[PDB]
Design a protein around this ligand. Structure first.
Ligand SMILES: [Mg+2]
Lengths: 129, 669, 64
DNA sequence: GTATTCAACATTTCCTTTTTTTTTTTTTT
DNA sequence: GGAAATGTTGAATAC
């Protein structure tokens, strides 16, 4: 239900009428049953665990002070060694703490083997610090 | 005693302990005064090249010598026979000079002294605070440091103030031309090294930094106090945090043998200003502008921004009616949005200085059209309040009367202010209150001889030097009052704040176990905090302890919230506290208006609750006067909240009006 | 800017009008000193000319 | 390759966010 | 020429 990222289906329904086909409730139920038969998580014991992570400022600060043990303050470590301007510090502390908390929870898990972070920026050589 | 200042109360040094150093007196006596510029610019550098010098400090001007600090077994040796070198005991130096020597030597006393012969900390301590990456295709950083030094005070006698100025360093390569040569003002400059752990910037002849900004005359600034989230890590990167760090470093390097104690200003009377009182003053203030016609004009060449419409919209937002016009109207209040003054090549091309001389009897105010946008482009309301209040002040000047109520000043007094056209006479203008009309004249030369006679030893502040200061003069008695900025910054209680923030950091380092929170749920059902806590525990996992970042919804305002956090602290989790409260009083000396009548000292600060980030220190102002006791009415002159924008002022209100009168006489004459 | 129905917007603060000078031989887009804020003032001539020219051009393409 | 004093313009605040904070593609010309 | 009040650079001094 977006027109930036999709066709306007309010306009298409006005203009095409019933030439805009739609699979019905019975058909959707049949497709739902078919998809369940191929992805039967519940009868086989697959569990989906969801966490919502906010900023972890103390956790990030402890990690930064471990990264550079003899530096003075974690704000200084962020500025100098990571290369973050004074404007970007709060934003980076926000998006970095969540990423690192998720990574730590992934690693400490016993048998998960394959993580995929999805950020907005790429972590290529332009952000090597 | 009172609020804390950068004025130094006592410098205590165990002189017999300085066993650890050898001090020599380098005397450049004998050589002629003409030979002085020939053979003194390199005297510091010739002393530096001689051997293992820690640092040197230029002595008192009448003594005409350099004090040089060396290791205990080291011996100074210069090849010049004209110079006199004698060993000097540590007790012969003035105490503050010896302290300046020892403050300089701190970086190489903390380290291993690195037996390379050219150790040098000739320039003092520079604590690195911020760094900025250079623009692309350049290496290195722009280092923003805070320098700690002692300087004798100007206004006060035989007293010295500890200073915390910002200093910027830039890489030497930035000032090198493309052909490989460095610029004119980058060659022969002292070169600095950044420490490997990144604390200090110190002198090194192999260094890569010089003490210049990236762009000429550009100013960087370190904020005074930062407590934005009670973060000790952000407190450390402020001037007061650097001062606490320096006080730690001083006793690390020298033990208890060297100590610097700051002075507390005696606290007679300290009144505070609430935002409610300021708003009450301001809403009644603007109402006097209704019964005068206000004109907005836009005389910028190539009118492009239509900022005049923005000014009109902002003015009517404060319910003041105004009209836009193509040209200024004689006899009405006029705002002329003009271009920048330098970009107009001639006076007659500038709208400013033209209608100013044309309409000699008309209130004027000017602005640039960039100065009404924020950084996101929205209208800047503070600018339009400032413009309106400046218009009100100038209208009060022209009408020779007060339009709003002002506190009663002293009776039978004349306000004199010299005007910059330096030991030659200046034009001195006067203001005076008779009945309810303000008179403004220009002082005659017959009067100014009596003023200069009665001012005694203080005549130099008014009749000598660049930027002389205005006076309040009492003609029937010959008594005077001069209001002098001492340059002494007034500090908050930085040590107690530092302890509290360290305790909060230590407390917040732990995550709260679920058992404690469930126990508080069980024990205190009447607390209103319980529902938010249950919601948070429901959202949270069942085993992992709760991080402090989840508590951010629960403030420290309600009594139940305070009881909850105090219970957590009793369980061993010091998570939140109050430091901006007036009960603690840490951020006095940055608030309200302090006024010690007995000593003649006063300062002014912000109003309301202390901001989480404070950018400036309030200076201490001193009242030089000839009274036995200063008249009580003098302190009424500071009870105005519109000379400064919604803030207490540090100059009497008759001097603002007199300044505006002098500014009006620029074009009429 | 114009969506061909409403919500017309012009970068000019002014009311750009369109005048034919027969003393010269020129159509002049001259600027009355109108302010950008009063965009709901009288419809100028330059916008009308551009809209009509667009209509005629698209009419030519459709007729093609 | 000096140290110290000092006068001249910057900066932040203001009846209190500047606002959100990126990488990615086919085809004819 | 937003203001006041604070603050720093560069420059001259300069001992
Ligand atoms: Mg003015």
């Amino acid at each position: 239900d977006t027109v930036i990222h999709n066709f306007d289906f309010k306009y298409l329904n006005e203009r095409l009428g019933n030439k805009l086909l739609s699979l019905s409730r019975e058909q959707k139920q049949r497709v739902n049953n078919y998809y369940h038969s191929r992805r039967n998580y519940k009868d086989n014991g697959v569990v989906l665990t969801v966490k919502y992570l906010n900023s972890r400022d103390a956790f990030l600060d402890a990690l930064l002070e471990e990264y550079k043990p003899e530096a003075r303050s974690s704000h200084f470590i962020l500025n100098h060694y990571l290369g973050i301007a004074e404007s970007e510090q709060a934003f980076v502390r926000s998006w970095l703490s969540k990423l690192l908390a998720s990574i730590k929870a992934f690693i400490s898990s016993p048998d998960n083997r394959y993580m995929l972070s999805l950020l907005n920026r790429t972590l290529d050589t332009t952000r090597q610090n | 005693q009172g609020p804390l200042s950068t004025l130094i109360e006592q410098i205590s040094i165990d002189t017999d302990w300085v066993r650890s150093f050898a001090i020599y007196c380098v005397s450049y006596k004998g050589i002629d005064f003409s030979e002085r510029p020939k053979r003194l610019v390199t005297l510091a550098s010739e002393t530096y090249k001689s051997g293992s010098v820690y640092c040197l400090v230029k002595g008192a001007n009448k003594e005409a010598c350099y004090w040089v600090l060396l290791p205990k077994d080291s011996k100074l040796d210069l090849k010049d026979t004209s110079l006199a070198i004698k060993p000097s005991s540590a007790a012969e130096l003035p105490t503050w000079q010896l302290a300046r020597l020892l403050i300089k030597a701190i970086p190489k006393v903390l380290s291993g002294t690195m037996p390379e012969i050219k150790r040098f900390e000739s320039e003092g301590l520079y604590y690195l605070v911020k760094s900025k990456k250079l623009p692309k295709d350049h290496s290195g950083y722009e280092l923003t440091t805070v320098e700690i030094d002692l300087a004798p005070c100007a206004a006060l006698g035989f007293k010295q103030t500890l200073s915390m100025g910002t200093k910027t360093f830039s890489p030497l390569s930035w000032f090198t031309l493309e052909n490989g040569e460095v610029q004119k003002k980058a060659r022969f400059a002292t070169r600095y090294q950044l420490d490997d752990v990144g604390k200090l910037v110190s002198k090194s002849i192999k260094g890569d930094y010089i003490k210049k900004p990236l762009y000429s005359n550009a100013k960087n600034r370190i904020q005074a106090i930062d407590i934005t989230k009670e973060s000790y890590s952000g407190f450390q990167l402020s001037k007061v945090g650097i001062l606490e760090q320096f006080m730690q470093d001083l006793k690390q390097a020298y033990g208890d043998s060297v100590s610097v104690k700051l002075q507390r200003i005696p606290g007679e009377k300290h009144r505070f200003v609430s935002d409610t009182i300021v708003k009450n003053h301001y809403v009644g203030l603007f109402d006097a502008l209704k019964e005068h016609r206000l004109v907005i004009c836009d005389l910028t060449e190539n009118q492009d921004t239509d900022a005049a419409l923005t000014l009109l919209h902002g003015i009517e937002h404060l319910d003041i009616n105004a009209e836009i016009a193509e040209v200024p109207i004689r006899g009405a209040l006029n705002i002329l949005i003009v271009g920048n003054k330098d970009t107009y090549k001639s006076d007659e091309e500038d709208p400013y200085q033209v209608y100013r001389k044309k309409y000699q009897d008309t209130v004027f105010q000017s602005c640039y059209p960039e100065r009404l946008w924020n950084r996101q482009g929205q209208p800047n309301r503070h600018v339009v309040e400032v413009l309106l209040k400046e218009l009100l002040i100038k209208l009060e000047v022209h009408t020779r009367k007060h339009l709003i109520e002002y506190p009663s000043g002293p009776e039978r007094c004349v306000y004199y202010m010299p005007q910059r056209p330096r030991d030659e006479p200046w034009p001195v203008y006067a203001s005076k209150l008779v009945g309810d009309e303000w008179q403004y004249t220009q002082a005659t030369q017959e009067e100014l001889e009596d003023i200069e006679l009665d001012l005694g030893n203080d005549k130099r502040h008014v009749f000598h030097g660049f930027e002389r200061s205005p006076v309040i003069y009492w003609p029937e008695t010959g008594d005077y009052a001069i209001f002098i900025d001492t340059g002494i910054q007034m500090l908050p209680e930085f040590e107690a704040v530092a302890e509290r923030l360290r305790e909060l950091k230590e407390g917040r380092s732990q995550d709260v176990p679920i058992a404690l929170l469930a126990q508080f749920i069980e024990e205190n059902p009447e607390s209103k905090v319980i529902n938010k806590l249950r919601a948070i525990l429901s959202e949270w996992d069942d085993v992992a302890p709760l991080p402090f970042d989840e508590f951010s919804t629960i403030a420290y305002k309600s009594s139940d919230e305070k009881q909850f956090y105090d219970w957590l602290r009793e369980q061993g989790f010091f998570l939140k506290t109050s430091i901006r409260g007036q009960s603690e009083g840490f951020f006095n000396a940055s608030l309200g208006f302090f006024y010690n009548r007995e000593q003649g000292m006063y300062f002014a600060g912000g109003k309301g609750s202390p901001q989480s980030k404070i950018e400036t220190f309030s200076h201490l102002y001193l009242i030089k006067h000839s009274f036995d006791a200063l008249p009580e009415e003098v302190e009424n002159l500071f009870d105005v909240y519109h000379l400064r924008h919604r803030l207490p002022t540090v100059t009497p209100y008759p001097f603002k009006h007199l300044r505006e009168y002098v500014e009006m006489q620029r074009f009429r004459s | 800017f114009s969506d061909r129905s409403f919500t017309h917007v012009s970068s000019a603060t002014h009311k750009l009008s369109l005048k034919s000078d027969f003393l010269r031989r020129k159509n002049l887009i001259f600027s009355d000193e109108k302010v950008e804020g009063s965009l709901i003032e009288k419809h100028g001539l330059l916008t009308r000319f551009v809209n009509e020219a667009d209509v005629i051009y698209q009419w030519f393409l459709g007729t093609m």
